[PDB]
Amino acid sequence: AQYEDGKQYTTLEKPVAGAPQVLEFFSFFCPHCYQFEEVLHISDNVKKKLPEGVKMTKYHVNFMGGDLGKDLTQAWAVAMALGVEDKVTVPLFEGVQKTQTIRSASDIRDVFINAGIKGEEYDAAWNSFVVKSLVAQQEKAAADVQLRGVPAMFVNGKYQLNPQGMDTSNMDVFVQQYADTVKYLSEK
Ligand SMILES: CNCc1ccc(Oc2ccccc2)cc1
Numbered sequence: 001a002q003y004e005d006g007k008q009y010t011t012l013e014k015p016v017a018g019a020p021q022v023l024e025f026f027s028f029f030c031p032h033c034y035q036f037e038e039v040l041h042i043s044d045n046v047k048k049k050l051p052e053g054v055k056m057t058k059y060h061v062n063f064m065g066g067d068l069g070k071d072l073t074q075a076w077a078v079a080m081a082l083g084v085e086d087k088v089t090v091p092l093f094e095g096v097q098k099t100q101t102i103r104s105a106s107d108i109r110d111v112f113i114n115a116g117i118k119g120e121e122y123d124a125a126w127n128s129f130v131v132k133s134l135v136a137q138q139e140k141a142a143a144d145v146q147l148r149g150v151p152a153m154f155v156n157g158k159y160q161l162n163p164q165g166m167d168t169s170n171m172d173v174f175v176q177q178y179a180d181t182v183k184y185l186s187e188k
Contacts, residue, residue, distance in 0.1 A: 007165045008181045012158055016144045019157025020057040022050065022182060025142060025150050028072050028096045029065035033151045038093055040175050042151070049179045054186050058085075059138040061150055065096075071105045072096075077134035078112070078125045087115040155185040 005011050024043060026033040036042040047056050060076035062069055072092070079085045091111045095102035102108055112122045125131055145154060153161040166177045 003181060003184055007162065008177075009155075009159045009162050009185060012145065012154075012160060016154075016157035019144070019154065020141070021054045021156055021186065022046065022056040023141060023154040023157075024056070024058045025061050025147055025152045026058065027061050027064040027069065027150050028092050029069055030150045031097065034093050034097050036151045037089060040171060042153075042175060042178060045175050045179045046153075046182050049183045051183070051186060057141075059141055061142055061147065062139065063148070064150070068096075068103070068105075068108075071108055073138055074126065074131065074135055075105075075108045075112075077131045077138065078122065080134055081125050081128070081131055082117065082121070084112070084115065084117060087117075088112060091115065153182065155182060159185045159188075161185075 003009065026037070043056070043058060050056065060073040062073050065072065075088075075092070076085075079088050088111055091114065092102070092108070095107065095111055102111070109122060109126075113119060145160075155161075161178065161181060163174075163178060166174050168174050
């Protein structure tokens with residue numbers, strides 16, 4: 001009983017059938033999500049412990065940042081459709097929270113242009129119904145679990161990570177505890 005329901009994780013009372021195996025939610029407006037991604041590298045370290053054949057999904061949410069918050073969910077959909085998440089995640093986080101130079105949908109587009117996505121390719125994707133379906137999927141998954149806080153991670157539709165029960169004196173130990181818990185939960 002080294003991992004206890006209620007301590008390092010909680011159990012959903014209404015488990016979600018058909019869910020992705022590892023499902024992470026975030027917002028580019030979310031201060032802890034900035035730490036999680038830019039300083040701790042949570043997603044990457046989880047993936048390096050996950051068993052073979054367990055895939056990881058990451059989705060943006062609407063409920064922070066009003067109008068721009070919703071623009072960012074559609075931009076994340078563009079990032080997923082074009083496969084350029086690894087190129088835009090850092091300048092989007094920094095544009096929103098560090099330099100505070102992202103203030104409109106056009107400013108979001110600038111980050112993609114600077115990362116090398118051609119202007120016509122971004123605009124075609126942005127207006128595509130493939131991207132509209134990806135926005136729909138992101139919203140659906142958040143609604144499925146009554147999501148009200150980010151950062152958040154879910155395993156096999158049944159378990160939600162609880163980082164509040166982890167020591168933060170050392171950032172590397174914390175990340176390792178987090179990844180090892182996702183691994184334990186995926187095996188279960
Ligand atoms: C819902 N928030 C989750 C959470 C909990 C603790 C936490 O502590 C850290 C903050 C910054 C850097 C390292 C750890 C960060 C996020």
